[PDB]
């Protein structure tokens, strides 16, 4: 069967503060139990560009805000190269509770890919955030966020660098699917620098869309 997920837990408000506090009470999937807190979005409803990642990392889970670690610094590098003010954005994630595993002698917490069940469970919060902010443009950072709004069969590589519209997205924002900043953290340097430049292209396009 198709799950209710977080729908039981989303209060009937468009206020981003009330939603974030309510999200700390969510039991829409299993991820609230081990995590410290919900990591809701950052920014205000006046934003015209919304950005969506995959899930919190270790430091996100401690801070309670998205993109505060290494991936967030690289994101800030990309936004600066695209002439975008981070505080003019609404930045969030498809999944709001840190999914992780502990380990014998490892890093304290190691992030684990959310399952599609968890992504669909958490999606009502994303819908609430888009209803709250009414973005004109939505940047989808990486495969998980893209599939969160475009469906489980969406392939980012098939649509890189296109401005899309979908039928189920509230307010009918333009959509730009692109690379996740964490992807620029490892790999061959050449590929990483060209990918960073491509991210910058997708951001400049997004900041230009009307
Ligand atoms: O906030 C964050 C941090 C790491 N990876 C994501 O997708 N979002
Ligand atoms: S992850 Fe999303 S759905 Fe699962 S419990 Fe936390 S908020 Fe609710």
């Amino acid at each position: 069967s198709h799950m209710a997920g977080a729908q039981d837990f989303v209060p009937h408000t468009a206020d981003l503060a009330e939603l974030a506090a309510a999200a700390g009470e969510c039991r829409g999937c299993g991820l609230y139990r081990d995590a410290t807190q919900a990591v809701f979005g950052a920014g205000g409803r006046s934003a015209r560009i919304m950005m969506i990642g995959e899930q919190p990392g270790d430091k996100e889970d401690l801070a309670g805000l998205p993109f505060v670690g290494p991936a967030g610094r690289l994101l800030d590098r990309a936004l600066e190269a695209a002439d975008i003010d981070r505080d003019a954005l609404y930045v969030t994630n498809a999944v709001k509770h840190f999914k992780f595993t502990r380990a014998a002698g490892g890093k304290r917490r190691i992030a684990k890919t959310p399952s599609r069940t968890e992504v669909v469970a958490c999606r009502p919060w994303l819908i609430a955030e888009m209803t709250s902010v009414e973005p004109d443009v939505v940047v989808l950072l990486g495969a998980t966020a893209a599939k969160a709004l475009l469906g489980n069969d969406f392939r980012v590589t098939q649509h890189r660098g296109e401005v899309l519209h979908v039928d189920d997205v509230p307010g009918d924002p333009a959509l730009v699917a692109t690379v996740h900043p964490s992807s620029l953290l490892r790999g061959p340097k050449e590929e990483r620098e060209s990918a960073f430049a491509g991210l910058v292209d997708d951001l400049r396009v997004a900041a230009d869309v009307r």
Side-chain angles (χ1 to χ4, degrees), residues 1-6 8-106 109-165 167 170-171 173-185 187-189 191-210:
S1 36
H2 182 65
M3 65 183 133
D8 299 40
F9 297 100
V10 177
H12 189 281
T13 179
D15 190 89
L16 289 177
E18 294 191 306
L19 292 167
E25 296 292 279
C26 190
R27 310 182 306 270
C29 76
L31 296 183
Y32 74 96
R33 76 291 158 282
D34 289 344
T36 305
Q37 70 181 118
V39 176
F40 213 70
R45 294 166 71 190
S46 59
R48 204 184 59 89
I49 303 169
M50 175 193 306
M51 213 154 271
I52 307 174
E54 179 177 300
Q55 71 141 332
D58 177 39
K59 187 173 196 234
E60 286 75 19
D61 169 84
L62 298 175
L65 294 164
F67 282 108
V68 296
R73 297 185 61 186
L74 271 279
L75 180 66
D76 287 343
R77 295 270 188 106
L79 292 170
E80 177 188 71
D83 186 57
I84 294 170
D85 173 11
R86 181 162 170 172
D87 287 296
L89 301 180
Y90 184 82
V91 176
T92 194
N93 287 306
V95 164
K96 302 178 151 69
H97 283 101
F98 184 36
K99 179 182 194 169
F100 63 100
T101 185
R102 280 158 178 124
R109 295 191 296 171
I110 309 155
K112 298 180 66 66
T113 308
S115 78
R116 174 74 174 171
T117 310
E118 288 151 347
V119 169
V120 176
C122 203
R123 193 190 335 185
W125 292 113
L126 282 186
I127 299 303
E129 292 171 295
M130 278 179 293
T131 300
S132 178
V133 173
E134 308 186 355
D136 291 332
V137 184
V138 178
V139 175
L140 301 165
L141 306 166
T144 295
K147 290 183 217 285
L149 295 191
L150 295 159
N152 201 32
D153 49 16
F154 182 85
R155 297 286 299 274
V156 175
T157 57
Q158 296 175 351
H159 293 282
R160 268 313 293 292
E162 296 173 340
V163 184
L164 310 173
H165 288 275
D167 302 326
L175 310 177
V176 179
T178 188
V179 71
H180 190 294
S182 288
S183 298
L184 283 184
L185 291 169
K189 175 251 257 168
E191 289 291 69
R192 272 184 313 96
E193 295 292 38
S194 100
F196 175 85
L199 174 59
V200 173
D201 289 342
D202 297 345
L203 293 173
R204 295 191 169 174
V205 162
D208 254 17
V209 165
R210 236 67 71 188

